[PDB]
């Protein structure tokens, strides 16, 4: 397995038609997972499965600008399961990141950070065994 937290450079930033694929297995009794598409210290797109937020499972998405988190976007469809292998696909579209988990569409996140070419790393952290993280153009 790859070492978590893992940094995946995104050379030249992201662009529409770029597909990022993350394969891993959720740890037993997981609490949290995060993907962080970063523009320097800013987080353009934070994708954060929470397994126990007041006894509910929820995906929280947000952006961090100058160390401040913005308005959260929440999704109660929750396709992750402790102990189980998953696939996350993040497709960059012109106006949003489009996320599918285990081949099922999950959510879209409209671009708040609009300098897509400056979003040039992806951090992967939290309660997973990370098998692979890669990108390709579709
Ligand atoms: C005013 C206010 C008060 C409380 C909060 S709570 C905050 O909410 C954010 C989304 O709006 C982020 O989720 C943020 N956050 C989570 C992580 C994280 C992770 F999600 C992992 F999965 C992980 F493995 C790890 F190491 C982490 F550090 N880092 N920052 C959270 O602290 C936010 C605003």
Swiss-Prot record:
Tissues showing expression: A major expression is found in the colonic epithelium. It is also abundant in the activated macrophages. Expressed in fetal membranes.
Keyword Disulfide bond assigned: yes
Motif extent (Nuclear export signal): 114-129
Location within or outside the cell: Cytoplasm; Nucleus; Secreted
A Gene Ontology BP annotation from the UniProt entry: epithelial cell differentiation
Modified residues (Phosphoserine): 76
Sequence positions that bind a beta-D-galactoside: 69-75
Keyword DNA-binding set for record: no
Domain Galectin residue range list: 6-136
One Gene Ontology term, aspect cellular component: extracellular region
GO molecular function terms attached to this record: carbohydrate binding; chemoattractant activity; disaccharide binding; IgE binding; laminin binding; molecular condensate scaffold activity; protein phosphatase binding; protein phosphatase inhibitor activity
Main location: cytoplasm
Keyword entries, A-Z: Acetylation, Cytoplasm, Differentiation, Disulfide bond, IgE-binding protein, Immunity, Innate immunity, Lectin, mRNA processing, mRNA splicing, Nucleus, Phosphoprotein, Repeat, Secreted, Spliceosome
Primary role: Galactose-specific lectin which binds IgE. May mediate with the alpha-3, beta-1 integrin the stimulation by CSPG4 of endothelial cells migration. Together with DMBT1, required for terminal differentiation of columnar epithelial cells during early embryogenesis. In the nucleus: acts as a pre-mRNA splicing factor. Involved in acute inflammatory responses including neutrophil activation and adhesion, chemoattraction of monocytes macrophages, opsonization of apoptotic neutrophils, and activation of mast cells.
Subunit and interaction comment: Probably forms homo- or heterodimers. Interacts with DMBT1. Interacts with CD6 and ALCAM. Forms a complex with the ITGA3, ITGB1 and CSPG4. Interacts with LGALS3BP, LYPD3, ZFTRAF1 and UACA. Interacts with TRIM16; this interaction mediates autophagy of damage endomembranes. Interacts with cargo receptor TMED10; the interaction mediates the translocation from the cytoplasm into the ERGIC (endoplasmic reticulum-Golgi intermediate compartment) and thereby secretion.
Protein name per its UniProtKB record: Galectin-3
Organism the protein comes from: Homo sapiens
Gene: LGALS3
Parent-record interval covered: 113 to 250 of 250
